[PDB]
Chains A and B, each alone.
With several copies, the nearest count.
Chain A
């Protein structure tokens, strides 16, 4: 009944989504072949949200992979749980944009996006009651940013009354993989503030920091980063798939965390996330989940919230817990550190509990906080955008494709008034 269609764009989207479908399918007891082999009847009750039964226990994921170079598509079918995707859902171009947001949004998008739209239509009408769409992509690249953002705009004018999640990693100076990161990020955010219902900010810098201190990993390849991101996505939509003492759906979270239609950029964290050396010395109670949740060194963005103010915050708990303990912990962390919270909204924290833990742990949690400190990223990105655009660097690759100069000035103005408007409510 409540249903989520999943869309992965670009190389960043494909690896994130790949590790994501392994985690969910393993939760529902479906083997790499795609046949049911679980034991509990509870695992079957809520597979309509992410899968379709094909025939003889075969469950296919409700996902759409979309990119421009076949290296990512072949890397997906090679790995395990690669044989579960329907091959027709691999809608796919051939030429390649290559870190050019104009190529991703004006030239190659104009002939690929009709195809990806047609697949999405079939996937949306194949089911009955849409809850929303779920899009994972990056903001630095071209085939994820420009094409994915165009897909977001096209979908929002098609189904305007449904929710839409987008999980986007954003560039930062310390992790600078491409050179035109600001020219891509600023134009992408301009479209996200006017189209997406809510966004969940991510970055690669914080993920590297998490893998160093908390995980204490030796060799953090991209597999572990995608593992953390996947655990977050599974944690937020766990409420629709399993019953609990206090269920909180996506729309219930959106209206509870967004006070104003333009303030929809969240920073996310997940607990418990501990190294194997210290996972043995730990206890599993509600206070230990909270004081590891609300730690600033556990956020998955490089935007320290104590440099700002919290508007609202949310925690999604999983496992057999006592709701009294849940509420008193949120009360304690809001009363002590009262300065870090907004003043004209009491009880800034929405809370919910679900009665199914992830496999391998006894009790877990998921934090979603809408702070005002997210403006550090907007100023941090806009100055690099300004530093090149005052001098017309790299501009002709954008200009000679169809974009003119007022597009950059309008994008600058909207990003600049956005960080200004975050600052006023701060």
Chain B
């Protein structure tokens, strides 16, 4: 059993540069990863940093795909003009990666939707993967732009135009912001001046905690097909809040008494979500709890009972059994130079609720304001688009808002 990982863009392969560092440091159990990867980007600067880095010999030279020139924060450019010449080479490699494989669980894609490469050719890669395989799962861990913290200007245009394909192509989509992670590193990790490297290190922790069930034998294992049923009650509602516990420094960890009861609680407070949204406004549709390390089924069982009996958070009226647990034996590993201390046990929670319906509504106004005056539209239209797909992507998010409001009732 193996699962291969695709990384797109400046954000994608930097996340991968930390994720693969953790995989090699963690390791027959290796068979699911050893790498079965592909980096691809339009700007050669970040890929060729890997080609000369410490992991020169680790990656086969062909694997590291690199175009000639960047899409430059332009969804249309990275989806219609420049994507068309590189995407064919990428997926015609990924095929022979799958032919190397025999028991493919799925693919997992890493991209940020704000940019052009992460968004544009992300969706383009996804569309040819869906028509080629269809049944095989493709987990997409995307990075959406934050409400108030922002680096680009045209990112609302990109985020809406990317989402329109992220609905019906990916199977399980995990949101991740930058402000929420910045807040996590500021609050729990007490790092007052964080950079992208620290963000990517703890993103890898989440990925590792949800594939450790395939790699190592636990008391209750859970495959990628399991998330497919247990968390998405409707074919078009798959957008997951993420959380992790205990995110804790090296000194505080020894002082505190980490156990199963309190980390099940800590994984539920909005002070520890990976996406800037308040689930107090929403109702939980389903929750999924990956437990790693020193876990007996009793205290995880007792912990979900206390959550259900609390009234600070509510569930939908549909699910009395609104949980999916999972226990694995091997504890989480640490990276030298990393900030997370060694813990006997950790919890990665992936939920689904209606709080996500707020982020789309928040997104709508920013896109709406700019589009009404036709700001920046001339860049995308001359690239090959029209006014049709702007308006039609707009009404797709309008439908999604009504959808969440209907299901939440």
Contact = CB atoms under 8 A, between A and B. Distances in A.
Interface of A: 1-2, 45, 129, 131, 240, 243-247, 249, 251-252, 254-261, 312, 321-328, 331, 344-352
A249 B70 contact: yes
B195 A322 contact: yes
User: What 4 pairs across the A-B complex have the smallest Cβ distances?
Assistant: A251-B72, A252-B72, A322-B193, A259-B375
B148 A331 contact: yes
A212 B206 CA distance: 55
B70 A324 contact: no
Interface string B67-80: 01110111000000
B68 A129 contact: yes
B370 interface: yes
8 contacts: A245-B14, A246-B151, A252-B73, A255-B72, A256-B154, A322-B194, A344-B375, A347-B366
A1 B151 contact: no
Interface stretch (B43-51, B280-288, B327-335, B388-396): B43-51
B110 interface: no
B141 interface: no
Contacts of A346: 150, 366, 369
Q: Which of B10, B46, B195 has the most CB of A within 10 A?
A: B195
Contact of A345 (B72, B149, B370): B370
Contacts of A243: 45-46, 49
B372 interface: yes
Given A243-B45, A245-B196, A251 B151 contact: no
A163 B119 CA distance: 23
Nearest to A352: B151
Contact of A255 (B14, B74, B370, B373): B74
A249 B148 contact: no
Contacts of A246: 10, 151, 196
B159 to A, nearest CB: 12
A30 B8 CA distance: 36
Interface residues on B, range: 35 or more
Contact of B372 (A259, A344, A348): A344
B376 interface: yes
Nearest to A354: B45
Contacts of A325: 193
Contacts of B182: 324
Interface in B38-96: 43-46, 48-49, 68-70, 72-74
Given A255-B154, A328-B149, A344 B370 contact: yes
B196 A323 contact: yes
Main secondary structure of the interface of B (DSSP, over half): loop
A99 to B, nearest CB: 37
A348 to B, nearest CB: 7
B152 A256 contact: yes
Nearest to B374: A260
Given A1-B68, A327-B149, A346-B366, A256 B73 contact: yes
B379 interface: yes
A327 B195 CA distance: 11
Contacts of B149: 324, 327-328, 331
B409 interface: no
Given A322-B195, A345-B375, A350 B68 contact: no
A348 B153 contact: yes
A203 B267 CA distance: 57
Given A328-B149, A347-B366, A350-B153, 14 more contacts: A129-B68, A240-B45, A244-B45, A246-B10, A247-B10, A247-B45, A252-B73, A323-B194, A324-B182, A344-B372, A345-B370, A347-B155, A349-B153, A350-B152
B118 to A, nearest CB: 12
B378 interface: yes
A324 B194 contact: yes
B369 A345 contact: yes
B33 to A, nearest CB: 26
B379 A255 contact: yes
A155 B399 CA distance: 48
Contacts of A240: 45
Contact of A261 (B43, B152, B370, B378): B378
